[PDB]
From a paper:
The last step of LPS insertion via the Lpt pathway is mediated by the LptD/E protein complex. Here, we present cryo-EM structures of the LptDE transporter of the pathogen Neisseria gonorrhoeae (NgLptDE) with partially and fully opened lateral gates. Importantly, we could obtain these structures by complexation with nanobody-based chaperones. Departing from the structure of the previously described macrobodies, chaperones that are built of a nanobody (Nb), and a C-terminally fused maltose-binding protein (MBP), we increased the rigidity of the original linker between the two moieties substantially to design an improved scaffold, named Pro-Macrobodies (PMbs), with excellent properties for particle classification and particle enlargement in cryo-EM.
After extensive optimization, we obtained a high-resolution structure of NgLptDE at 3.4 Å in complex with enlarged variable domains of heavy-chain antibodies (VHHs)—PMb21 and PMb51. Whereas NgLptE in our structure is nearly identical to LptE structures from other bacteria, our structure of NgLptD shows important deviations. The lateral and luminal gates in the cryo-EM structure of NgLptDE are more open compared with LptDE of Klebsiella pneumoniae (KpLptDE) and even more so compared with the X-ray structure of Shigella flexneri LptDE (SfLptDE)12–14. Only three hydrogen bonds were observed between β-sheets β1 and β26, which increases the separation of the two gating strands at their periplasmic end in NgLptDE by 3 Å compared with SfLptDE and KpLtDE, with at least six and five hydrogen bonds between those strands, respectively. PMb51 binds to the terminal β-strand of the jellyroll domain mainly via CDR3 that is forming a β-hairpin-like structure (β-strand augmentation). The PMbs did not lock LptDE in a specific conformation as we observed additional states in the sample.
Author numbering:
A (entry chain C): 5 to 483
B (entry chain B): 31 to 158
C (entry chain A): 88 to 604, 621 to 801
D (entry chain D): 1 to 489
The structure:
C-alpha cells in the first residue's frame, strides 16, 4: 500500500491552502483518516480526523474554527482546508491510517508535505531603531501568537520596488515619505484605512506627507531633519555661519583635530548648504510640483556646492568621507562637529562625548534648508498580511509604548503621535531638530524624486572628487 | 408387536411424539410396559451467536436441540441409546427483538416436531 | 488370629515374641513385611524392626520403627513413604515422622506430598505438620510452600484443605489472571452461610481502571430459588466514571402448582459497561438487556388446555460508541391466554392477547388480539392434508398522537390456508453402501383478504427470515401489526437419504418457490454428512428476472479423529444493515465473510486451537484467536495460553490474552470466553475434586 | 496477651557518599519461627515498603524491585536480632530505616504481601553527599558544575559551601574531625593540611604529567612529594575601567600623580585591600621583595624579602599612597571590587577571580600588566590551584580520581574561569587560547615575573606574620619597616 499527499508550499499568514491525501492500495472507503503534523524539531501532535462517510469530525481544541477536514470517496482522497494561517501553523503534515493489515494491526504514514507560513516581515533602514522595533514585534507576538521579524537590507529603498514588483518582499516597508509616491504609482502599496479617531492622534501635516492621489498610502511615524551636532568640550560656542569653519579647522589642526566631518556620499547631507542660497528640487504649487521647473542648475545651488568643494580643496574636508567615517571621527572626539539627524544621538551617548545639538550654520546670511523627511510605514500590495500589518502599525507601534521602545534604541526625532511628542518636546535636541525642519522644507513624494536624488548624488560626488566642475555637475543634474 | 407404543420421560416432546405416533396408527396406552416403551432422559437446547457484521453487530443466531433417548423393553439397561439433533438459523437484525423473541418460539416448535418425526422414523425402521 | 511366618521365635509363652528374617503379621486384610521385631507386654505394643515394608490395601508404607499400640491403633513411624491408592485417584507422601491419633486422625510432620507419581516430581507442597482428620475434613498445613519445578512459588503460615467432597466454606476458590489493558487479576473468597444459601465475595483489580468488587449470592428454599450476581467499582482511572455497576436476578418462584413468578433482571450503569471490560459475546443479546416479570397457569383438564401470564418488560438498550440507540417499545401489561384441545380428529386452537406499549420518542397505545383458529387434519396412510379457518381481529387505541394516526381502529382478516402434501419412498436411486432414498413433495395455499393498515404504527412486528421453511408459514411479517394479504401456492420437494439399518439422516435436500394469484424468487438448501467427517451444510436464496442472488451460504467441517477438527463456513448477502448511522438509518452494505477454525495437535504433547473470521468487504478480519495447550505424566503442566483480538465498535479493536493452569485431581475446567468453534474439546487433565481429593485411609 | 511490641531498631550506619553497615530490629520472648519482618526505607516526608524483605522458617527473601545486587537481608536467629548488610551505598538512600515486624502473610516472587504490626522504632541511616572544602574566593560553582556532572556519573550527591577562614580552618579546625574531602587553595595551607594528616599524596598518571606544565608540578610538589595537583596558576593583574581611563599608567610612580588629578575630580585612582599581604605583594616584589632565597627546593628561612630593604621600600611607597589617601586602610577587597563595578575607582589591584564579578556587572573594563616600579615591573604573588583528598571521610577514593580528571580539564579550567577566573592555567591547550585572550595574557606575563609561594607549613606561619605586618603598615600604628622586621623575626 502507499499514500502520497500534495499541495505544500509557502503562503503568508492569513492565507489559505487545501492539502489532498490521494490514497491507494486498499479500500479507503471503509476506514478513518488521521491527519497529523510534526513541526521541524518538535513533537508530533494531533490535528483532526474524518469518519467513513465524512458525517462526523473531531478537531483539536487548538485548531477549532481555523481548519476543516473533508473526504471524497470517488478518488480515495481526503482534503484538509486551512484558513487564517499563522506562523505557528508551519509543520510537516502526515496522512495516517490505522489497522489496515492482514491482522488489523498495521499503520502507514505518507511521504508528507511541507507547509511553511513565515513571520511578519518588516523592512527598516540600518541607521534606525530596528532592535527597539523588534521589541514591539515581541509584544505583538505575545498577544497574538504570530512572530514578527525586523530586517535592515542594504539599499532597501531600491530593493523594495524590485521585489514588490516580482510579487513578494516585506509585509511592511519603512522609509522617508519621498519614495512612497513612486511605489504608489507602480501599484506596490496597499491603501491604508485608519478611522478619524486614529487620524486625530497624529499631527495633520504628517498625514499630508503620506498623501498621493488623495489616498493615504502609509502611516507617518516621525519627522526628521539634519542638525549641527558639536562636541561642547572641543567647541563650547559652535559657529553660526559656514564661512567661519575654515578659520576654525586650522585652529583645530594645530590641536591635531578638525572642525567638521559629515557624510558627503549622500546628497541629503549636502542639500542644506546647496538649498540655502535658493537651490531647490521641484517648484510651483505643492500639488503641481512643476516637474519642468528644477532648481539644481541655479546660482544658489552653485554657490553652496562651490563652498563645499572649496572646503575639500583647502583640506578642511575629504571627498571620501561617508556616514561611517564621520560618525567614527566625531564619537572618538577627533572632530569638533558633524551633521546628522536624530537617529545618530544613541551612539554619541555610548561614546561618552559631551555634545550639544543646535541650528545648522548660515550660508551667505541665509539659513541652511534641510529636506525634511517623515519616516513612513507603507503596507506592500503583495503583502496580503495587511490586516496583521494594520494591527501592528495602529495598535502596537503608534502608541506611547511602541514609539518609546523604538526611540530608546535610536531617537525618531519629532514623533507624529501627539501624545508622545508632548512628552518628547522638552528635549533640547528635539527643539533644535524642529527649528532646522522649519527653516527647511518638506520633501516632495512624486515619482521623479528617485531620479532627482540619483542626479544630485552624481553631481555632488563628481564635484567633490574633481571629475566635474560645479557648473558641469549641476547642468548634468538638471538633465 | 410394536404397533402400539408407550412413551414416558421428557416433558417438552410429549405432544409431538404422540402426534407422530398417531400418524403411523399407533396407540399410546398408559402403564403398558409389556410392549417396548421409549424413555427420553432430557431435552437440551441453546442459542448462540453465529455471524457478526463488520462493526460487531449481531446478524444471525444459531439454534440447536439435542435429544437423547433409549428403548426400555420393560428393563432399564437393555436396548441401545439413540441421540438425534436438529439445528436452524435465526436472522436477528439489530432491534426487531420484540418480534424475534416470539419468532424463536415457533422455530423451537418446528424443531421439536422435526425431532419427534425423526425419532419415529428411527423407531419404525427398527420394526424389521 | 495373627500368624507369623518366621521359623524361629524367641519367647516362652506370652511375655515377649521376637521374630526375625522377613517376618509377617497376618491380621487378615493387612500384610506386614518387615525385617525384625521385639515385643514387651506392658502396653501391648509392637515394633517392626528396620525396613518395615507394609502393604495392606494399596498403601505401600516404608518406615523405620512403627511402634503400634493396637489397643486403639496408635502408631508412630519414621521416614514414612506413604502412597495411598483409590478408585480413579492417588496421593504420594515422603514424610519425616508420621504419627497417629486414635482413629482416622494423623499428625504427619515434615512432609513433601503431591497427587503425582514418583521421580523428579514436577510439583509438591512441602510443609511442616499436616494434621489430617477424618471427623472434620480440614487438614491444616503449617508453613506450606507450594514448590513448582525447582523453586518455591508460594508461601503461607497456615492453610486448610477440603479433605472430602463437602462444600468447603471459607476456601478462597483459586484466581483469574489475564488481560491486555492491564494485568487484571481477581481472587474470589467463597464463604458458605448455610446449607441452602452461600454468598461469594470476590475482590479484584483491573490494573488500568481501578478496583472491582464483583460478588454474588445464591439462595434456595422449598419454593423460591434464585441467584443475585452483581459488580461495582469506585472511581475509574481510564474512562472517568465513578460509580459503575451491574445487577442480575433470577428468583424463580412457585405459588401453588400452577403459577410460577420469575424475575429475570439485568442492568448496567452506562451505555459502555460491555465492550469495555466484557468478553467477545457482548455483540449479541447485549445491545439491549432484559428486565422481566411473569406469571403462568395451566390445566382445566376437561376439554381445555388454558395458559396465561402477565408479563411486564422494559429493555435497556446500550449505545454503540457515540450515543445512537434504537430503544424499542416497552410492554407494561400482557394478558396472554392460549388454548388447545382435540375434538377427536379436528384440533381447535384459540388465543387472546393484550398489550400497552409505553414510549416517549414514539406514540403509545394499547391493543388487543383474538385469533380463534381451527385446523382439521387428514393423514390416511401416505399423504396428509390439513385445512384451517382462523380469524385475526386486532383493535388499537393510540393516544397522545403527534401526527396522523387514527384514534381508534379495528380489523378482521379471515385466514384460510390448506396445507398438505404426499410422500414417496424409493430404494433404486441409492448412493453409498446400502442407503434408502426418500423423495417427498408438498404444497401450501393461504388466502388472506387485504386492507389499508399502514397508518397504524409498527409496535412489535418484523419481517421473517426468508429460507426454505418460510414457504410454509401463513405470515411474512412474523408479528402482530402487519399481516400481509396473500393468495399463493408454495410448491416444494425435499428428499432425505435414510440409512439401510437404522433411521439416522445422512443427507437432506430440497427446493421450493411460491407462486402468486408469479415466481419472483427461488429457495434451495442441502444439509447432511457422511458421519463424523465430510460434514456439509448450505443454503441459497435466488430471485430471477431481477438479479443474481440474495443471501447464499456454504459450510463444511471434517473430524479426522476425536480432536484434529478443521471446521470452515462462508456467508454472503447484499443490503445487510451494519452499524446504525447517526439518524437511525442503518448503514446498508453487502457481506462477504469466511471464518476458519482448527484444533490440530502440532506435537505429541502440544495441541493448538485457531480461529479466523475474515471479511472481504473491507479486507480486515473481524475476530481471530490462537491458543496452545500442554500435558505431561503428573499433569505437571496442564497449561493453556489463549489470545484473542476481537472488534468492539465500528473501528475500535481490542485484544486480550488468557492463561490457564491445571494440576491433576485439584483444579477446575470451564473458564473460557464463550462457545467458540464447534467442539474445542479441552486437551488437559479432568481435575475434578479441585482440592485435596476425596480419600484418606491407612 | 498478644498486644506487646518489642522491635526497637538497634545498630546504625555512619558512612558518607559510599559505604556499608549492619542494622538490627531486636525482639525478645516471641518465637521467631513464624514471626518475620521486611526492612523499610522511610525518607523524611514519605512512608513506604522498604528495599528488603525476609520471611522466617524456610527463609526465602523477596528483596525489592528498587535494589538489585545491593542489600541482602541476612538471618541472625543466634543473635535474636536480624541484620541488613548494605553495599555500594549512595546518598539518595539517606532516610529513616524500619522493620515490618509482621506475624502472618503470603510470600511470592512478586513480593511478600504482609502489612501488619509496624512496630519498627526507626533508625536514620546517616549518609552525607560527597564533600569538597574550600573558600570560594575563586567560585567553586564552575568546578561544582564539573563536579555535578561527575556526581551524575558516580550517582552520588555533592556537598560544598561558600565560606571564610578556610585557609585557617582546614589545617587546625579539621584536626578535630571536620574538613571535608577536596580543596583547590594556596600551597602554604597545603603543608598545613598534610600536617593535620587529612590531606593524602596524589600520584598523577604519566599522560597527565605531559599535559600539565612542569613548573606547575614543581609548585604543587611539597617536601619533594607530589601531595597536590595544580588546576591552574593564579597571578594578580592590574584592572582599569575603560570609561574612566582610556590608557592605564605604565609606571607605578605615575599612579600617585594620576591619583592627585582624580582627587580633584573626587574619585580615587586606585582602591584595593591593604589588609591582605598577597594583594600588597606586587609593589613589594617590584622592589625586589622575595618569599624566600636560594634554590626553590631549599626555601632557606634565614633569607627573607621582608628583612631585605627593598621590600620595605616597596611597602613604604604603598603607605605614601595611604598618606595621600590614594589608598584607604578602611577600604577592603570586597569594597574595592564594588567600587570598580560602580566606577568610584578608576583602577584596582585584584586577584584573577575579580574579573568574572566585573563581567557580571558589565561595566566597560580592561585587564593590563601591573605598572613598572622604579624601572622594574610589579610582580604579583603566584598561587597554584593544588588539590587534595581527606582520609577520614568514608568515600575518600572519589576525590583522587575527581582531581585527576574532572577538576583538571581544559574545558573544565574554562568552567571555573567563567564562574571566577584562575588566571594562567596548568593545561597547555587552555594556555594557548588564554594567550590569545587579553585578560589572562596580561596575568601570564605577570605570573612569569611573580614567584610561587612556598608550600612549607613554616612559610604559612611566616605568611600570617606578614598579614599582621601589612595590616599594621596600612593602619600606621606600626612603621612599615618595623612591621616587616617583626614579620622576619
Amino acid at each position: 500500500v502507499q499514500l502520497v499527499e500534495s499541495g505544500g508550499g509557502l503562503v503568508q499568514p492569513g492565507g489559505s491552502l487545501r492539502l489532498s491525501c490521494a490514497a491507494s492500495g486498499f479500500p479507503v472507503k471503509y476506514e478513518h483518516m488521521y491527519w497529523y503534523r510534526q513541526a521541524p524539531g518538535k513533537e508530533r501532535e494531533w490535528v483532526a480526523a474524518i469518519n467513513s462517510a465524512g458525517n462526523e469530525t473531531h478537531y483539536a481544541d487548538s485548531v477549532k474554527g481555523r481548519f476543516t477536514i473533508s473526504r471524497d470517496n470517488a478518488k480515495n482522497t481526503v482534503y484538509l482546508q486551512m484558513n487564517s494561517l499563522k506562523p505557528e501553523d508551519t509543520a510537516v503534515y502526515y496522512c495516517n491510517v490505522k489497522d489496515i493489515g492482514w491482522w488489523a494491526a498495521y499503520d502507514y504514514w505518507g511521504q508528507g508535505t511541507q507547509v511553511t507560513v513565515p513571520p511578519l516581515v518588516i523592512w527598516i533602514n540600518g541607521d534606525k531603531g530596528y532592535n527597539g522595533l523588534a521589541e514591539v514585534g515581541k509584544k505583538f507576538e505575545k498577544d497574538t501568537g504570530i512572530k514578527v521579524t525586523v530586517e535592515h537590507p542594504d539599499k532597501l529603498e531600491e530593493k523594495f520596488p524590485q521585489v514588490a514588483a516580482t510579487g513578494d518582499g516585506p509585509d511592511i516597508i519603512f522609509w522617508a515619505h519621498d519614495r512612497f509616491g513612486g511605489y504608489a504609482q507602480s501599484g506596490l502599496l496597499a491603501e491604508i484605512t485608519p478611522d478619524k479617531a486614529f487620524q486625530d492622534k497624529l499631527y495633520p501635516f504628517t498625514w499630508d506627507a503620506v498623501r498621493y492621489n488623495g489616498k493615504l498610502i502609509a502611516y507617518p511615524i516621525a519627522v526628521e531633519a539634519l542638525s549641527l551636532i558639536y562636541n561642547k568640550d572641543l567647541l563650547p560656542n559652535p559657529p553660526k555661519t559656514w564661512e567661519e569653519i575654515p578659520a576654525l579647522d586650522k585652529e583645530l589642526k594645530a590641536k591635531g583635530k578638525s572642525a567638521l566631518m559629515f557624510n558627503l556620499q549622500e546628497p541629503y547631507f549636502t542639500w542644506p548648504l546647496i538649498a540655502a542660497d535658493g537651490g531647490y528640487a521641484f517648484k510651483y504649487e505643492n500639488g503641481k510640483y512643476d516637474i519642468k521647473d528644477v532648481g539644481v542648475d541655479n546660482a544658489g545651488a552653485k554657490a553652496g556646492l562651490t563652498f563645499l568643494v572649496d572646503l575639500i580643496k583647502n583640506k578642511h574636508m575629504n571627498a571620501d568621507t561617508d556616514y561611517s567615517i564621520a560618525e567614527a571621527a566625531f564619537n572618538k572626539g577627533e572632530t569638533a562637529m558633524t551633521i546628522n539627524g536624530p537617529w545618530a544621538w544613541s551612539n554619541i551617548d555610548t561614546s561618552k562625548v559631551n555634545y550639544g545639538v543646535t541650528v545648522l550654520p548660515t550660508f551667505k546670511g541665509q539659513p541652511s534648508k534641510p529636506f525634511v523627511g517623515v519616516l513612513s510605514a507603507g503596507i506592500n500590495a503583495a503583502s496580503p498580511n495587511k490586516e496583521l500589518a494594520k494591527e501592528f502599525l495602529e495598535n502596537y507601534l503608534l502608541t506611547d509604548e511602541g514609539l518609546e521602545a523604538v526611540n530608546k534604541d535610536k531617537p525618531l526625532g519629532a514623533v507624529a503621535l501627539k501624545s508622545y511628542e508632548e512628552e518628547l518636546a522638552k528635549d533640547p535636541r528635539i527643539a533644535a531638530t524642529m527649528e532646522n525642519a522649519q527653516k527647511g522644507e518638506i520633501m516632495p513624494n512624486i515619482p521623479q524624486m528617485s531620479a532627482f536624488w540619483y542626479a544630485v548624488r552624481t553631481a555632488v560626488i563628481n564635484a567633490a572628487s574633481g571629475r566635474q566642475t560645479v557648473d558641469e555637475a549641476l547642468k548634468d543634474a538638471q538633465t | 408387536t410394536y404397533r402400539s407404543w408407550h412413551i414416558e420421560g421428557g416433558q417438552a416432546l410429549q405432544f409431538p411424539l404422540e402426534t407422530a405416533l398417531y400418524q403411523a396408527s399407533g396407540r399410546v396406552d398408559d402403564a403398558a410396559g409389556a410392549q417396548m416403551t421409549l424413555r427420553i432422559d432430557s431435552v437440551s437446547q441453546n442459542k448462540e451467536t453465529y455471524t457478526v457484521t463488520r462493526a460487531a453487530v449481531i446478524n444471525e443466531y444459531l439454534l440447536i436441540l439435542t435429544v437423547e433417548a433409549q428403548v426400555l423393553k420393560r428393563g432399564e439397561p437393555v436396548g441401545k441409546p439413540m441421540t438425534v439433533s436438529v439445528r436452524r438459523i435465526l436472522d436477528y437484525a439489530d432491534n426487531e427483538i420484540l418480534g424475534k423473541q416470539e419468532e424463536e418460539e415457533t422455530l423451537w416448535a418446528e424443531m421439536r416436531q422435526d425431532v419427534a418425526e425423526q425419532i419415529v422414523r428411527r423407531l419404525t425402521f427398527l420394526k424389521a | 488370629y495373627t500368624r507369623i511366618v518366621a521359623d524361629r521365635m524367641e519367647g516362652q509363652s506370652k511375655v515377649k515374641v521376637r521374630a526375625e528374617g522377613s517376618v509377617i503379621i497376618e491380621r487378615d486384610g493387612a500384610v506386614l513385611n518387615t525385617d525384625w521385631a521385639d515385643y514387651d507386654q506392658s502396653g501391648d505394643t509392637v515394633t517392626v524392626g528396620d525396613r518395615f515394608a507394609l502393604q495392606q490395601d494399596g498403601t505401600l508404607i516404608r518406615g523405620e520403627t512403627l511402634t503400634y499400640n493396637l489397643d486403639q491403633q496408635t502408631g508412630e513411624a519414621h521416614n514414612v513413604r506413604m502412597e495411598t491408592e483409590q478408585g480413579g485417584r492417588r496421593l504420594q507422601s515422603v514424610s519425616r515422622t508420621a504419627e497417629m491419633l486414635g482413629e482416622g486422625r494423623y499428625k504427619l510432620t515434615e512432609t513433601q506430598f503431591n497427587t503425582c507419581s514418583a521421580g523428579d516430581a514436577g510439583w509438591y507442597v512441602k510443609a511442616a505438620s499436616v494434621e489430617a482428620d477424618r471427623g472434620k475434613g480440614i487438614g491444616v498445613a503449617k508453613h506450606a510452600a507450594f514448590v513448582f519445578g525447582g523453586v518455591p512459588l508460594f508461601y503461607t503460615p497456615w492453610a486448610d484443605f477440603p479433605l472430602d467432597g463437602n462444600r468447603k466454606s471459607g476456601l478462597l476458590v483459586p484466581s483469574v489472571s489475564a488481560g491486555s489493558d492491564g494485568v487484571s487479576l481477581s481472587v474470589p473468597y467463597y464463604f458458605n452461610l448455610a446449607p441452602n444459601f452461600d454468598a461469594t465475595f470476590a475482590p479484584g483489580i483491573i490494573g488500568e481502571r481501578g478496583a472491582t468488587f464483583d460478588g454474588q449470592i445464591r439462595y434456595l428454599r422449598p419454593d423460591y430459588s434464585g441467584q443475585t450476581d452483581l459488580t461495582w467499582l469506585p472511581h475509574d482511572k481510564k474512562s472517568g466514571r465513578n460509580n459503575r455497576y451491574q445487577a442480575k436476578w433470577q428468583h424463580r418462584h412457585d405459588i401453588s402448582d400452577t403459577l410460577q413468578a420469575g424475575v429475570d433482571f439485568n442492568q448496567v450503569s452506562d451505555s459502555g459497561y460491555y465492550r469495555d471490560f466484557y468478553g467477545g459475546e457482548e455483540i449479541a443479546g447485549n445491545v439491549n438487556l432484559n428486565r422481566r416479570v411473569w406469571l403462568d397457569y395451566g390445566g382445566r383438564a376437561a376439554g381445555g388446555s388454558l395458559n396465561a401470564g402477565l408479563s411486564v418488560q422494559k429493555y435497556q438498550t446500550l449505545a454503540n460508541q457515540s450515543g445512537y440507540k434504537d430503544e424499542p417499545y416497552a410492554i407494561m401489561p400482557r394478558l396472554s391466554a392460549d388454548w388447545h384441545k382435540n375434538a377427536g380428529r379436528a384440533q381447535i386452537g384459540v388465543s387472546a392477547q393484550f398489550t400497552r406499549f409505553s414510549h416517549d420518542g414514539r406514540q403509545d397505545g394499547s391493543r388487543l388480539v383474538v385469533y380463534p383458529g381451527i385446523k382439521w387434519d387428514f393423514s390416511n396412510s401416505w399423504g396428509y392434508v390439513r385445512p384451517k379457518l382462523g380469524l385475526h381481529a386486532t383493535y388499537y387505541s393510540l393516544d397522545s398522537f403527534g401526527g396522523k394516526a387514527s384514534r381508534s381502529v379495528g380489523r378482521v382478516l379471515p385466514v384460510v390456508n390448506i396445507d398438505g402434501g404426499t410422500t414417496f419412498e424409493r430404494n433404486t436411486r441409492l448412493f453409498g453402501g446400502g442407503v434408502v432414498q426418500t423423495i417427498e413433495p408438498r404444497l401450501f395455499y393461504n388466502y388472506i383478504p387485504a386492507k389499508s393498515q399502514n397508518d397504524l404504527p409498527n409496535f412489535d412486528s418484523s419481517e421473517s427470515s426468508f429460507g426454505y421453511g418460510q414457504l410454509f408459514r401463513e405470515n411474512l411479517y412474523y408479528g402482530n401489526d402487519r399481516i400481509n394479504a396473500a393468495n399463493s401456492l408454495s410448491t416444494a420437494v425435499q428428499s432425505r437419504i435414510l440409512d439401510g439399518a437404522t433411521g439416522e439422516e445422512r443427507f437432506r435436500a430440497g427446493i421450493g418457490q411460491k407462486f402468486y394469484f408469479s415466481r419472483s424468487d427461488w429457495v434451495a438448501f442441502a444439509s447432511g454428512g457422511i458421519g463424523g467427517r465430510f460434514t456439509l451444510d448450505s443454503s441459497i436464496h435466488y430471485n430471477q428476472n431481477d438479479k443474481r442472488a440474495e443471501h447464499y451460504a456454504v459450510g463444511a467441517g471434517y473430524r479426522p479423529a476425536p480432536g484434529k477438527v478443521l471446521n470452515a463456513r462462508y456467508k454472503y448477502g447484499r443490503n445487510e444493515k451494519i452499524y446504525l448511522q447517526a439518524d437511525g438509518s442503518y448503514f446498508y452494505d453487502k457481506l462477504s465473510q469466511l471464518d476458519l477454525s482448527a484444533q490440530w495437535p502440532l506435537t505429541r504433547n502440544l495441541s493448538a486451537v485457531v480461529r479466523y473470521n475474515y471479511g472481504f468487504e473491507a479486507k480486515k478480519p473481524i475476530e481471530m484467536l490462537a491458543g496452545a495447550e500442554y500435558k505431561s505424566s503428573c499433569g505437571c503442566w496442564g497449561a493453556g495460553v489463549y489470545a484473542q483480538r476481537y472488534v468492539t465498535g465500528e473501528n475500535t479493536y481490542k485484544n486480550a490474552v488468557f492463561f490457564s493452569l491445571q494440576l491433576k485431581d485439584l483444579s477446575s475446567v470451564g473458564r473460557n470466553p464463550a462457545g467458540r468453534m464447534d467442539v474445542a474439546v479441552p486437551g488437559y487433565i479432568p481435575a475434578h475434586s479441585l482440592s485435596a481429593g476425596r480419600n484418606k485411609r491407612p
